[PDB]
Amino acid sequence: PQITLWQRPLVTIKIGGQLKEALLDTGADDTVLEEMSLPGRWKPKMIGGIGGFIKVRQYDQILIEICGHKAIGTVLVGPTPVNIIGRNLLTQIGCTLNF
Amino acid sequence: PQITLWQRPLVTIKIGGQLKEALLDTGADDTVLEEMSLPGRWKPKMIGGIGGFIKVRQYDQILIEICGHKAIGTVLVGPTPVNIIGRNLLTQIGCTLNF
Ligand SMILES: O=C(N[C@H]1c2ccccc2C[C@H]1O)[C@H](OCc1cc(F)ccc1F)[C@H](O)[C@@H](O)[C@@H](OCc1cc(F)ccc1F)C(=O)N[C@H]1c2ccccc2C[C@H]1O
């Protein structure tokens, strides 16, 4: 589809068998979701944005469905104020910026 | 133009007769640039990101050229890690997300 930017570009995603709301964020290098339980081992990481850095748990090889599209990639979990779908997964669904 | 997201969506902008690099960020509600001098009076604003909040200066009716497209709107100035072009200006240039 084609998404306008008059409002925040929020979409529904399916992960770990759960439906959540997330933001399509071209300014985010990676994908970060609010605290939740995911399978497998994880690695600690620090990510920075406006305001500073936060510590997150890094999980690799996670399957996510974005608007009916299946994508696989690294997913970070931590105290983010909103669920963020970053570039690492946006590329997999063939998302582009156009004007 | 059509921009893929395999790399950061950086473009050249022109403001105050100077060329700068900025990120096209659909996840940012507003446009914020690194410390610089702009004309007129400013008002205070607080913006929150992934790591907390930062105080910025708000300037209105500022001319800014993005990838050749002229836009006139609100620009925030403050301790941002990178120059960010937010939805307020992305909509002025007709930018949309597609997949
Ligand atoms: O921190 C960032 N990337 C980092 C990131 C994020 C997730 C995972 C990894 C990485 C690392 C880095 O890319 C991005 O900023 C630029 C940025 C880019 C970069 F390239 C390096 C450092 C940077 F600061 C960030 O994802 C923004 O896309 C956006 O974050 C999601 C979000 C959306 C909301 F609607 C509300 C709250 C919220 F938090 C955000 O902070 N929006 C707020 C904002 C911004 C400017 C003006 C006003 C307002 C109010 C909000 O909209």
UniProtKB/Swiss-Prot annotation, chains A, B:
UniProt-annotated catalytic positions: 25
Lineage top rank: taxon: Viruses
Region Dimerization of protease, residue ranges: 1-5, 49-55, 88-99
Residue ranges annotated for the Peptidase A2 domain, each copy included: 20-89
Known partners and oligomeric status: Homodimer, whose active site consists of two apposed aspartic acid residues.
Known function: Aspartyl protease that mediates proteolytic cleavages of Gag and Gag-Pol polyproteins during or shortly after the release of the virion from the plasma membrane. Cleavages take place as an ordered, step-wise cascade to yield mature proteins. This process is called maturation. Displays maximal activity during the budding process just prior to particle release from the cell. Also cleaves Nef and Vif, probably concomitantly with viral structural proteins on maturation of virus particles. Hydrolyzes host EIF4GI and PABP1 in order to shut off the capped cellular mRNA translation.
Protein name, per record: Protease
Organism: Human immunodeficiency virus type 1 group M subtype B (isolate BH10)
Organism taxonomic ancestry: Viruses, Riboviria, Pararnavirae, Artverviricota, Revtraviricetes
